[PDB]
Amino acid sequence: PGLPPGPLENSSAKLVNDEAHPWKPLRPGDIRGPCPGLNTLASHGYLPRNGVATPAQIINAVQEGFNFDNQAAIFATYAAHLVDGNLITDLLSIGRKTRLTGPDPPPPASVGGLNEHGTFEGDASMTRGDAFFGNNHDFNETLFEQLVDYSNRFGGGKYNLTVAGELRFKRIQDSIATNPNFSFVDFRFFTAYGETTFPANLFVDGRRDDGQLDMDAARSFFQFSRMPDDFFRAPSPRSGTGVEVVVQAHPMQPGRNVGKINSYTVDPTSSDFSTPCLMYEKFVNITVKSLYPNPTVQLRKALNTNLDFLFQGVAAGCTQVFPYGR
């Protein structure tokens, strides 16, 4: 594995929909998944256009194309790679499972790409349906139209953090009401909130950076993986700033439905926003370790390297944990 890239040398706003990075349609075999950011980077050639990439390629692409901040890029990328990528070949699919990531490790590891439900991807996404309903990765028009409606109602026709706060809660309540397997704990509990800020922070043209995303731009990213014509990236590195507004709108406890609709039951063993270090510790000790309980020599080495890289993205104050020793 390569070292995690460092922050941008020059993080100014600039044209990112440029001559070197044109949008192109999908070819047969090209993979897109549940993340409109990575999808857009692949469809503009910031990532390989087939949607299979190394962690270093992903980190460079999110920084260069969108000004995603370095710490956030490192944590997300290595978390995804650990649970969804091939640690020997150093390749991760941004969507469905593919033979392009190379020879698989033994069960119970899945190397399922970002489409793998319950590892990184989870329920109550804004524009993708819950995995229980049959498709956790494709753009959903009905859900996008709901995003438009919430933008009309709470954002004057634009998507902003106020809209995010209301839509985040709506999606949770809809999953509680209809998905008997709804899960909203630990890693998904965190990412579900942060992801709702990303359209306001990163899909807004960086010459404005006003947190007000228009619906034409929103559809372009969410549906077509396409930057608006003349799109400038954000003017400074960021990811989840303003997530507090989203949480404050409708504070929730982590929990799950318990095999029936309308049975949301709080999980006191889950991390929440009061215990961010616990979220990291459980991700490593439980989630990663369960996929690789007794790895062979070359896998153990790759796990430890990628776990070291993951820890670079963890907020200062947390203690590193070592599931396979040092």
Ligand X SMILES: *[C@@H]1O[C@H](CO)[C@@H](O)[C@H](O)[C@H]1NC(C)=O
Q: Annotated binding site for heme: which residue ranges?
A: 35
Site for ligand X in 171-200 (CB under 6 A): 181, 183
Structure tokens at 153: 């109602």
Length of the chain: 326
DSSP, res 49: T
Minimum gap (Å) between residue 238 Cβ and Cl ion: 8
Q: How far is CA 214 from CA 156, 165, 219, 221, 299, in A?
A: 10, 17, 9, 11, 45
Q: Does residue 191 touch ligand VOH according to CB under 6 A?
A: yes
CB under 8 Å to 152, separation ≥6 — which residues? Answer: none
Alpha carbons 183 and 198: distance in angstroms, whole number: 22
Minimum gap (Å) between residue 14 Cβ and Cl ion: 15
Structure tokens at 33: 């998944």
131's contact among ligand HEM, Mg ion, ligand VOH, none, with CB below 5 to 8 A by partner kind, is: none
Tokens 């390989």 belong to 48
Q: Does residue 125 touch Mg ion according to CB under 5 A?
A: yes
Site for ligand VOH in 70-99 (CB under 6 A): 72, 75-76
Q: Is residue 227 within 8 Å of residue 142, measured between CB atoms? A: no
199's contact among ligand VOH, Mg ion, ligand HEM, none, with CB below 5 to 8 A by partner kind, is: ligand HEM
**3-state SS of the chain: helix, strand, coil percent to 5?**
40, 5, 50
Task: With contacts defined by CB under 6 A, name the span among 9-17, 25-33, 188-196, 233-241 that binds ligand X.
Answer: 9-17
Q: Which is nearer to ligand VOH, 40 or 160 (CB)?
A: 40
Minimum gap (Å) between residue 200 Cβ and ligand HEM: 10
Task: Please enumerate, by residue number, every residue annotated as part of a binding site.
Answer: 35
Residues that bind ligand VOH (CB under 6 A): 35, 72, 75-76, 190-191, 194-195, 239-240
Which residues make up the interface to Cl ion (CB under 5 A)?
7, 69-70, 237
